[model samples]
Target chain A: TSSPVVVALDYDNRDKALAFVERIDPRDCRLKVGKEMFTLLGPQFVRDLHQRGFEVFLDLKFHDIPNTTARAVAAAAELGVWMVNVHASGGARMMTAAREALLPFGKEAPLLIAVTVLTSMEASDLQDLGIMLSPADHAAKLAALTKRCGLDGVVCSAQEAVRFKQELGQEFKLVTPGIMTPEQAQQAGVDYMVIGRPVTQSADPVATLASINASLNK
Target chain B: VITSSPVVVALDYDNRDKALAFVERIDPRDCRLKVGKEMFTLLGPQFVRDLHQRGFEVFLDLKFHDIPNTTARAVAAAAELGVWMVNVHASGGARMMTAAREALLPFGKEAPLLIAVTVLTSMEASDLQDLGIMLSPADHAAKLAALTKRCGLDGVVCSAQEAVRFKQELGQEFKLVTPGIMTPEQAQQAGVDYMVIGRPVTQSADPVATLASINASL
Candidate 1:
């Protein structure tokens, strides 16, 4: 239950995604369904994925006006996902609203998280948005706000896990879609590691997942 | 019957009844329609399919911002919806936008015209400043505009007023889809490739007449 693998189901095709899910053991790793799969399959897909025994992470990354984003996050709760997220850059009000939207679900609510920065963006890209903070600093800054807004944690690149571990309290966690490794995850207190192609696109998904799961056995 | 008109009516209602009822009032050939997160989360894709059934080209304006694979897969799902256009946050950076573009290549001629949002019309300079963005809205928007074009997205979403400025700054040839048209005259001289009119049209006493009045300018 404490393992750190979260397999990103990047497939836009339903049959392939479902078959891939079937090939893996849920006890080993959780599943992440991003916008593509969620949009294609809708809420029923999340429900079906859960029925397959995997605790699904609904990675829609909601970003909009506060009311709209809050409404969207509240709806994602209805899907009964293990976790859901919004872009932290949407600022304090949006993140706070999204967090508050999850309250009515009580203890059964999905873990609400925030996205600090896209792994695709670099410092220059931040500058392009008139954001001078280096990606590391920016991720930390957003993560701080995410914690303040009552989110469970954030999904950022694994490279910056040390800052989060050192700065934010332990219960305020980290979910790195792309991890450094399990040893690093254990050391840095990374709660969940998200891996996509390396496992999902492998020739033998179960073996890859098994090996990856074994590697996480600290 | 200028179905190719530049006006896009934003169906920003809070309920399915109002949105679908609004769809019943207008001829799809007069202008296109846009569904943002509000109506979208409320009604789901069935509303868009319903809009399509009535012969309207729809824009799913969710403003996606995520990692390359997640955002790209999301864009792929939008393409699957058979909508006329879709958009992402340019701030998600070059790789995110490029991945979204490539995801649609298989769709070829049927792919949605991928666009990127530079900034929301509602925010102010200080609003961005609070997020550590020092640049004025226009400057920030220009940086995103260049990135969107560099990544091969079809257009940028901005205010109708900003579109005019970007026309001189970035060139007139690129697609500029602007919202916030307070008057039909703005649409006429806006110099934008497209204009999204929401309240001024949808909240009107006679939506079709109001839409036609604005569409006439285009």
Candidate 2:
């Protein structure tokens, strides 16, 4: 099976990120270029990751206006990323603009997803924000909204993956972050599980990743 | 005369060479620079450093939005970069914004100004309503701005069109960093503390002259 594992490169600098990337097999897992490393390294870093034969997920979570966000997604597609994302809260038009922007790419367009309720949030957290829905339910609602707006899927937590699968259907992708371990990921119905510190900051990243792959496959 | 530059010319370019070349033509004193996801994802932190080395106060427009701990860490990272300002989506709510604010407490006055993105300038009232946001664009932005301020954030990133209401409601000290500034009059508007203009200045044949015209208007 092609690894549903997507390792998040969250290092603060190029050397560390690149060093960690060196440890993972591209075939075993995809790569995520998130805010920290991207902010520190830029597109050149993503290109480097791509050159190394990894499919890159450009996780900028763009939430600008319709045209700007659309253009940003277009640029991400231009960079040949495997995936790109926008904030689900960006609303229908913004999401629609982003989806439309990818049309020019035709079949080569990367998977465009929306970020639902973050893994770090909970029911109380949403309540405080005036969102009465629980995190899982909120993610499900956002996932439905995302699908209606023509997005491929959502970046939700593993906790909500089952709910998303049930609500959004099997065809809609679910990219889960905040995955604690590979064993936990093995049971989830998510399309992709994003692992960061557990893999990158492990005692031995290569072995840890290998163990993850081995266990998940088992 | 106002002392610091209010106009923040968005250094939106595809590559480092072009971006660096453009930075050379603009006066840092006349305007600060905004490194949004596009330029930042392409050039990274070194570009921000490069701009700062050239005497420009940089707004690292990454617009971070994550769970509290994650967003806080990203803010801390931005603070470490010594950006003049940084932002997160207010929709992320009080805990996340407060986490960002508290993380910068150790840095004290040295902390990068923390702002919240209320609504993208590209979105309108109907677009907002479609997202389950019943409030008009300006009203929604104001509500988010209020929540952001209550959470102890520094200011907000809204459109120039909403500046007047923000000033009237939130008071003058509450900074309004407006993007989509096409005209010199928008740059000179009373309520907006900072204006982010992208392609108009960056893609112009004579960036210096265009910047000068903007500054003179202000």
Candidate 3:
């Protein structure tokens, strides 16, 4: 319930990202650097965001073998970002490999999360892939599997938020994307609902966050 | 087979048994295993160490490219994991790559070999043109490879098409890992030293036949 909103810095240029950051309060939101931007701006972009005093999620969503992913995760830890991620599909062994690889660093390691299923799709998407299970079911299965493996958390959609919290408990972090405000949703011409507009697009972002805290108390 | 240099197999798939089978066969002799996005998302990191216990070197290819200090620390973390190879983007440039190299150097051989990606072999000249890069793909690769080597990396990942020319221009001492290679016929036609292939061998009707074909062709 007290999780910070992860404001995605989705652009591929450093100056532009920084310019965007200048418009918002860092304390009101954490940051996510994904492939679209990371591929162009590189890890330096992650550092620049971190330097600005925002919590960073180097969300490249790596899904390699144990050693490769481990080294990669270690590299992210080196960046000193609060969180980094690997594809949960990597399974227990691979997740454990990455996890064990970081033990030597102790507290310096980033909180490693696993990506469950993409947000854009639903249970039907899973079926289309011949996965048989419903989207929620597949996500639940992945959540159980990921949690049992002893990593950190999982990437879930806003629609599954209630379900994930129900099963995984409120303690496990669920980074939800596909968020938008009603005002912005109207602009985008779709059902662009979001949980973060109160934090990211608020007049006083942090105060909006405080209001969120008050509302959640009920 | 002229396997003089250490070869790392990238487990870029979703099947553990298949990866396990490859490790079982290639154990003790091959230099290392590369666990990439596809497999790692499914397997996680502990599985990487499990393979290491089975006596395979693991090359962690996370391609980190953050700022100097963050990149350096991430490199240091990789050293803690005791991987055989690690990488960052050369595009991070001289200061960042040099700092990464220096930071990891303290760990000595236990630290993974630091490399930089120049250009993905999957890209063609037209792709570069789309990016508005006027140079040919190989030319861009060689220039970037040369830049990375100058910045003090162990080697670079590039298409084989550029290897011979790079060998002639940059010398045989540098490590040149080529992907996008299918059969030996394809490799020979492209004229690269090491042909790193995926789908053709792993998903083919005959894996051994495909591997042998590439090996013989190379």
Candidate 4:
């Protein structure tokens, strides 16, 4: 099994994205298609990636009312991706509705995750929202809520993963999104890592992947 | 003449044809149109242009919440589509909101009004508590709206129930666009700058008349 270093394909050019995907073996890494690619290329593009043997993480970070958000996640699942996500702050009902919406898919359903405190935010940023908790504590709190609401995992910063794993245990996945380098991937308790610019924009992406794998394995 | 219409009809249809058919009967001058997640996901940017051609300002109700860069780019894309307004999740914190706000600088006065989504109207206080948020939904919404305004967002998407208080605190320029509106009277009420009505008008037996009634009340 892969050590969970997922490559974030944030490409705007379809040809470049497809060519890049052609080089990366799915056994070594999974793929993530967020708003940019999904907006530009649509579901068929995701299906094309799937056909190329890559398990996809469809990171839309859906945050709407219960019914609407649930339906959106169901649509993502319909695309046959390996993982999907909603915003944890969407509350229990929205999260519960999303989980229930995927039940008909059974084991075929993509891993339903929630995004906690975004990796880009710091403690002062949270404080600006009148939230006094540190980013790690805040994410751990949201991760626990996600678990109770029956979500399979969370999309969080690498720095928060160790705290989440400690609070919720290894079974509850912590998918880190801002790991820019191989060294950043070696953080404790990161079940999955999403590496973007450092890999995709590198001089030799294949070599960078090898370096990341080696660092993570060590 | 200062337009007083606050009705934003949610065109929550499955496809373009059905939504367009409904649009044909309604006058854009009387009300705004909300192209929510479902219709937007299905129809893409073309739908926004279609509504604008018909003289309706579109509110792109895709409650975006991702890392700062992703969410900012998505909002910029929406602004480029010439939407009247767009929203991001307030829980996404200060950095993301600031990034989105700054991304609109090039658009200047033409930028689609940037709004932040507070607690969704569908969730209750207990639901938020379950998510480890101790504050009541209204209070949480108010706090988030305050943060949103400080971050340079033009307004917030909150419940009409919180309208009077938000108006009292945040002043008149801080727009309060609300959903979960069930009555014409609610649309006419003070402090709610815009009211989103779904299914009520779209699924009505006589949609144009229903929309007119809503407009008349406003």
Candidate 5:
């Protein structure tokens, strides 16, 4: 659970990020500072998480022109986070520019990930907008395109993980959400059970993390 | 006296002949000249450079909003233009702004003073209400201005009336540029402390005198 999971410090204030840092410790949890907190607090959030000994993923999703995106990636490389992302909609040229931008720093840069699809979106929703394929197919195509463009990883769903590993292999990272226990998924009147809070906020967080890890290993 | 309204004259005719004729007739020293999407589309960045060569302090109003990587590269292009001012929307948030600033850092103080557009001059309070942002136009404008400043942006595009109050609350260093101004005679308008005069002066009998008189009133 600990190895496969990144605890999202989704709090919107400096006080909350710090509070999480103080309590969680780096050993039990890797950290993700997403769009909400980073926009509110800035990159000091990442640096603070780093100082607390967590491998921080700076998850402010970016998408832009090649030249601009590259320079941005270079700056993030200089800042030294573990991973970051750009919207897959930016196309292959943009992804190439982003990877090339990080060239100056060489090995110092974080792993650049491409967001395959927003978790909130569904296939029917995309189809309604005239998108030809299912969400999973679109995600796979984007993932393949990102890989061909020299990006290190693609952020995708756990449902895609088992097949992607068989096809694309485990060379890149797959950061999945929507995790639920079999019992939780099967329970009557339980519509959604992909709960990070349930695990992190449990009576014993480490045990919760370990149980999740053991399942992933299986 | 420190004037609140900074009128950057907009050249948006979408035709080179009309744009050049307007520029030739107007007095450049009386106001800042803006080269936005229309002029840029008609004549490209060369048009901006041409204006700069003729000693007009140019405002290159290409509203860039992208990921950190892409925005930084765009900033580099703008810096190369030697612009007096430029802006992006405030909604793009911190990492984007920080990356843009960091990209411009090599040029130091000589780089363009970057600002943000809170809301367009065409938009009223009711327009924002339609978007579910219920704050009064001035209040929303001020809040966006503060957010822009906090992210280390130089200033904001706001109304002339709000400029004095914003400066009082935020500080004098925060620049304000006001547009949508008109004469009481022709437009039957309420006069403001500072106004962006386009049609009034460009089509006037004595362009130079009109420019001087507008500045004198300020």
Candidate 6:
């Protein structure tokens, strides 16, 4: 019952963030350092996160033109994150360029994922942007496009796993987010789950994480 | 004369030498700087601090578009950098924008102006159509602007017409940022809080004269 959670290290201040980083065991969960931590701490922090034994996921969600996105991904590979991501909406050439940029790393390349429609968005939000499909359908479309572009997987909601698993196959990978509990994360459809405040904000993150993972043994 | 101008010169350079060389030639008073994905991931935040120490206020234009808490924390990090502005994709929905807006609340007036990108200026109507978005880019941008407005963001980035219209409605103080204004004529013609000029400024032999002309025209 090992937890599949990637604890998002979203804290801003260095001293406070580092203190929390030390308390968590990488054996129990991997860590995520999104734009916030990366911006606040720089590449050295990601390296430091590794020194403590956790695999890191760099969640910048890059969405730029092909050359820029590709080069950024290459930098991420150079930094040695376990995973990194781009925007699926950035289209095929951008995603393909990013995927190819990591090829020099060969087997050491981080898993490259693409973010689709966010869980925070609804059908109306998509409609506002003149996107006609429901969120689920739009996500499926993007996931298919992501697959075609040669990406490892996508950042999507857990519910969409049904369509993704059936259509794209389980090897395509699915990364979900927004879990505040262990019981909430029992399903096996997800390849990775990004959890933030539930663990990071805890007075005792080690104990909180234990309940979220160690209790899974029950 | 407009002593402070809205032209955000996109420092999309992959070569660190050319990038810092260009930085030394410009006046931050004439135009703000934008560190897009390429320069950002490559040079990291140290370059952003370098830009800051040299007197330029940066638009950390990585375009945060993830879950609410994640995206919010990223914006907060940008605030810590004391960047002049930050943004997310409007398509991420109300909660996402509001979370980003709220994160900046602790910074108050010192917060980087938060905006949302409706559609990238590079995207054409046909490009959006392929993604199932049927509205003309301008119209779609207007709708997304409304969402960002409701979420209490400073403004949004879009093509000319929609942004101009939003500026008119939300007033000049609102952050209606435009990206595709390539020349002084367009800079004179457009009504936006920021004009993100990429090649038009960067390709020029003298960034000082090029940017000074832009500031004077505004």
Model 1 regions lying over 4 Å from their true place: A1-4, A23-29, A197-218, B1-5, B12-18, B38-47, B101-110, B150-152, B199-218
Give, for candidate 3 chain A, the lowest lDDT window spanning 10 residues: A185-194
Chain B TM-score by candidate, in order shown: 0.93, 0.93, 0.80, 0.94, 0.83, 0.91
Please state the CAPRI-style docking class of candidate 4: medium
lDDT per residue (tens digit) for residues A1-218 in model 1: 45578888877678888898888888888888777666776666777788888898888788876777887877777667788888887878788888788888998788888888777778877776677788888888878878888889998666777778778887886888652566666667777888889888899988987777776653
Report residue B41 deviation for candidate 5 (angstroms): 30
List RMSD in Å for every model shown: 3.4, 3.1, 15.4, 3.2, 15.8, 3.9
Least well predicted 10-residue stretch by lDDT in candidate 6 chain A:
A179-188
Q: After superposition, how far is residue A3 of candidate 2 from its true place, in Å?
A: 1.4
CAPRI-style quality class for the chain A–B interface of candidate 1: acceptable
Per-residue lDDT tens digits for candidate 1, residues B108-201, read 9999888888866655786576577777888888888988887888889877667667777777777888755245566447677777778888
- Going through the candidates in order, their DockQ values are 0.44, 0.55, 0.04, 0.52, 0.04, 0.44
Question: Which ten contiguous residues of candidate 1 chain A have the minimum total lDDT?
Answer: A177-186
Docking quality (DockQ) of candidate 6: 0.44
lDDT of 4: 0.81
Deviating ranges (above 4 Å) for candidate 4: A1-3, A22-28, A51-53, A157-163, A179-187, A210-218, B1-4, B53-55
In model 4, the clashing pairs are none
**Shift in Å, residue A156, candidate 6:** 3.6
Kindly report, for each predicted structure in the order presented, the TM-score of its chain A compared with the true chain A.
0.92, 0.90, 0.78, 0.88, 0.83, 0.90
| TM-score, per-candidate, Cα-based | 0.85, 0.88, 0.51, 0.88, 0.49, 0.83
Per-residue CA lDDT of model 4 for B92-204, tens digit only, reads 88888999999999999999889999888787878777666678878888889999999989999877667778888999899988775335575446677788889989999
A127-184 in candidate 6: lDDT tens per residue? Answer: 6666778888898888888999889999866666666778998788788755324444
lDDT of 5 by residue, B1-218 (tens): 11233456767564578778877875556677876543442345678777877768877665555556556666666777688777775545556677788888898887988877676554566544433345676776777777778778887776666755787788866776655533422221222223445666666787667766766655
- Judging by DockQ against the true structure, name the best candidate: 2
